[PDB]
Amino acid sequence: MLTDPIADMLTRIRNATRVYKESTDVPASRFKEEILRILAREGFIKGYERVDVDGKPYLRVYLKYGPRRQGPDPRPEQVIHHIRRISKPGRRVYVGVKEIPRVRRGLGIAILSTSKGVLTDREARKLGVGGELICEVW
Amino acid sequence: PTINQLVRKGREKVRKKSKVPALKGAPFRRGVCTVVRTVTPKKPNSALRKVAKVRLTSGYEVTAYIPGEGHNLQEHSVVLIRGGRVKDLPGVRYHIVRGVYDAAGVKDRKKSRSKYGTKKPKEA
RNA sequence: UAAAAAUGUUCUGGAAA
RNA sequence: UUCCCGGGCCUUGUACACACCGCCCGUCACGCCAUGGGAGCGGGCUCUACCCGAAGUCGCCGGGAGCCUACGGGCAGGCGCCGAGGGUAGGGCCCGUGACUGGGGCGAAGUCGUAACAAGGUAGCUGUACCGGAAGGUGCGGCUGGA
RNA sequence: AGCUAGUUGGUGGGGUAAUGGCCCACCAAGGCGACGACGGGUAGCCGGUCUGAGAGGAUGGCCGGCCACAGGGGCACUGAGACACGGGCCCCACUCCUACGGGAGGCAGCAGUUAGGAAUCUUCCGCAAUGGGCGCAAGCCUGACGGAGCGACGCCGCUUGGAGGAAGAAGCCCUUCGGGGUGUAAACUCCUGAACCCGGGACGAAACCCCCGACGAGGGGACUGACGGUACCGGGGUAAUAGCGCCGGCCAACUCCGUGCCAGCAGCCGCGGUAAUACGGAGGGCGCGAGCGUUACCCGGAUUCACUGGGCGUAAAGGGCGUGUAGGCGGCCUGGGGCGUCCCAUGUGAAAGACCACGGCUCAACCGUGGGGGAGCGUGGGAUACGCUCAGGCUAGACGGUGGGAGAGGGUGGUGGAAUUCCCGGAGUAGCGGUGAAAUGCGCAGAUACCGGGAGGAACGCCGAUGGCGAAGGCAGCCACCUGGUCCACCCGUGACGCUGAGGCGCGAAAGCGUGGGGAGCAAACCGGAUUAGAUACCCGGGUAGUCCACGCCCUAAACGAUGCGCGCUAGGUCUCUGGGUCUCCUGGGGGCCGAAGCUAACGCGUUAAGCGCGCCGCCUGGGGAGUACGGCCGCAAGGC
């Protein structure tokens, strides 16, 4: 019945990225697209695009990796290294604008849901707003 | 466990148990030896450790150890319990403080004298 | 997976390296 | 080449590694220690109901009794309610203690055996039930953490 | 684990500065509780303090705020205020006076005594300052307070000297008897001058008050210092204390002698049994120094109760399994509200402390001034992504409908053959039976082996599994009736109706218990035989509960995949049961094996996860004591929880 659409989405991405899949499908949600828009702009994925699997509204995320490597195990480096859901239904997490986390010294990003829209840590900080802390990605 | 299960039951503080009920934690405690004998130690080791069994001002009668070689305690010598156990003596959990009350310092001691009553000899 | 085959006891305390 | 002794090589089980001249289980006996039960005994606190009920505010009276003035009233004085405490009785909680008794932990070199670890010589473990100085044995069913 | 009679509310009163059952009549039956009522234990709360990277943890002594108490206890009077620390009334206990009828006191105010204790100070000086009461004022009072005293109790500053001085005195210790070390250390040379001496000697104190001006503003005047003849300054000026721990590893520091599992050490691991860097002494060394160790307690380390930040197949840890109450949690689109949430403003957040800057005591410790933080909670304004709420819309979760399927799933009745035992009838004779070998036992009163017939009970061979069904326990001849789960197909209906689940309720192998029934085979207990040192066992011969049925209890297990339920996601290969297919093979549900990625301490697990995720529940915090005791609930008991 799926208890956390987002959590699931983050997970489906994680799962395929880790098996060098070209793209992954995830059930469509307006809120979810938002996340994805951000995931694409900051560059973590190649892009998404509303599509339809067996007559139902889905979102096709296109994964991005690094270049092939040498030695044993030539599996390329990963663009989406980490991606963990922070606020879950079992315990929500709201953060004041001053409280906003700094992900990986700057080389990473958290994704907030604010009264001004789903924005990133930088965007949220600049806009001086705070919110529910959807996840973090590095 | 689920956050909800923590909200409900929550965690549990440890609560340490004292290895020395000399009441009030009292750094020390005074008492009287009612029995001053020598017990045989635990295993690996063999010997004749000298231990006193003292009645306390905590309302407890415990058995304690008389550190150092050669002591002067009798069935009624008042003594100051210190608390510090002895590995071989199954029962002893306290040390008698040398150099207080009837407890005499260790005659002729010259090293770590501070830990054995034994004052300080004049280089004479 | 199905699964036969032996009447008969014991070795004080430490320490080996 | 079945067997007895010593030994090669592979394999299997092991709780052995001081290395099977190994490890190790329970009772009994001996000592210290904490602890349950125990005719009952000594307490601390607490609850109910009852009898006695000081001081004191409060409410009646204030009279066949005194005194005041700023005496239509007041005061002294009497009656009652409540009431600290005391007293009889019976409950609750906790603590100390008790002849004797139950098992427990610990304790260099005690006694009996040999349950387990190698089909540990009757594969082991297990819930239950009966039985036995002791480990334990057997029944019924279950497990493989056995072949 | 249930609690409540002034108990919960009402009306009218009394009462009070005032609300109110605060108290009282009358009336109504209420109030409170797993979001932990009632009860038991402990405790004054806070600013802060210690610790911590932080979140936290521990704590509440000094100073500051609030509360409460004044020998134990009850009450009121005066009054702005007290039911009053040095006021009162009374009871009580205790101690004292008494001309015995009545009197007296209450240091948890300051000093001081005694008791208890491991332990905590002077019966000090001064109202000079600050602060207080009363006074027009002078001024009086003030153990508040300002100082002084004692205690290394703590912090900080300082001293015991400095510079020369030997291929290196002595003594002590080692030694391969050359020597090496203590060691520039000493001695010795110069040099400074802690103490002490003489002289000088404070700030803190300027107004109250007085005079000019009006006793206003402003200006001037006088008195006053407990600490003290102290700090401080000038001159003079003597080489003038050193200890405590430790030196096996953790951990800085090694040799000789003594001892010989002794004496002793020990925080953990462990040192000692005749060559001990571990015991004890010495030399030497290391550390710290008016100190240095020891004990007790707090935090850390201990991500070792894990929010940050842990776990449960085998290390502790998945509940025996279901159904479900409270609770927690919840798909897709849109709109209203704006509780959560976020943003601005603003009030509040005392002081001290902490931090920073700068200053004052010769420095520091102390100390002052200034600066900066602050969540929380109040108020007003605003945002609407996500959560929440109302509303409308949807169908992907879920449920239903129709058509079908497999199956030891369950209950009830009936019934079929093999076999064992026993009985009867034949027929037959000398042993059978059993073991490693035997013996007991059965048998010439005719057994065993054989044929026929009978009674009776219990379980179902082959099929048959690496199979199937069930939530688990568990279910196996065959037939019928009643009945549960469940899967495929069509996508037809409902339209989030969902997941999970503390409690509750139901089920729950074997053994065991209560009635009654049943009893062939088997078989605890029990009796023999044999084995053995013994044999309460293994082996052999007997055998009662029981095993079987009914009804009712019991409620445990290696109740096991030692692996909770649900959903999404993440290579394949192969075998297999059951369904649908446009039956090469595809597709759905189930049972296995091997293995991508990944996970694991490893073993291993791997679309039937022990992988990657979300929701809810259960459970684990070292071994033993112990699944024991006490208490409670349950049971006929055994015992269970």
Curated annotation (Swiss-Prot), chain A:
GO terms for cellular component: ribonucleoprotein complex; ribosome. SUPFAM superfamilies: Ribosomal protein S8. GO terms for biological process: translation. GO terms for molecular function: rRNA binding; structural constituent of ribosome. It holds the Pfam family Ribosomal_S8. Keywords: Ribonucleoprotein, Ribosomal protein, RNA-binding, rRNA-binding. InterPro entries: Ribosomal_uS8, Ribosomal_uS8_CS, Ribosomal_uS8_sf. It comes from the Bacteria. The keyword Ribonucleoprotein applies. The keyword RNA-binding applies. One of the primary rRNA binding proteins, it binds directly to 16S rRNA where it helps nucleate assembly of the platform of the 30S subunit central domain. The combined cluster of proteins S8, S12 and S17 appears to hold together the shoulder and platform of the 30S subunit. Belongs to the universal ribosomal protein uS8 family. NCBIfam families: PRK00136.1 (NF001109). Part of the 30S ribosomal subunit. Contacts proteins S2, S5 and S12. This is Small ribosomal subunit protein uS8. It comes from Thermus thermophilus (strain ATCC 27634 / DSM 579 / HB8). The gene is rpsH.
Swiss-Prot record, chain B:
PROSITE patterns: RIBOSOMAL_S12. One of its GO terms (cellular component) is small ribosomal subunit. Keywords: Methylation, Ribonucleoprotein, Ribosomal protein, RNA-binding, rRNA-binding, tRNA-binding. Residues 105-124 are annotated as: Disordered. GO terms for biological process: translation. The modification 3-methylthioaspartic acid is found at D88. With S4 and S5 plays an important role in translational accuracy. PANTHER family: 30S RIBOSOMAL PROTEIN S12 FAMILY MEMBER. NCBIfam families: rpsL_bact (TIGR00981). This is Small ribosomal subunit protein uS12. The lineage of its organism: Bacteria, Thermotogati, Deinococcota, Deinococci, Thermales.
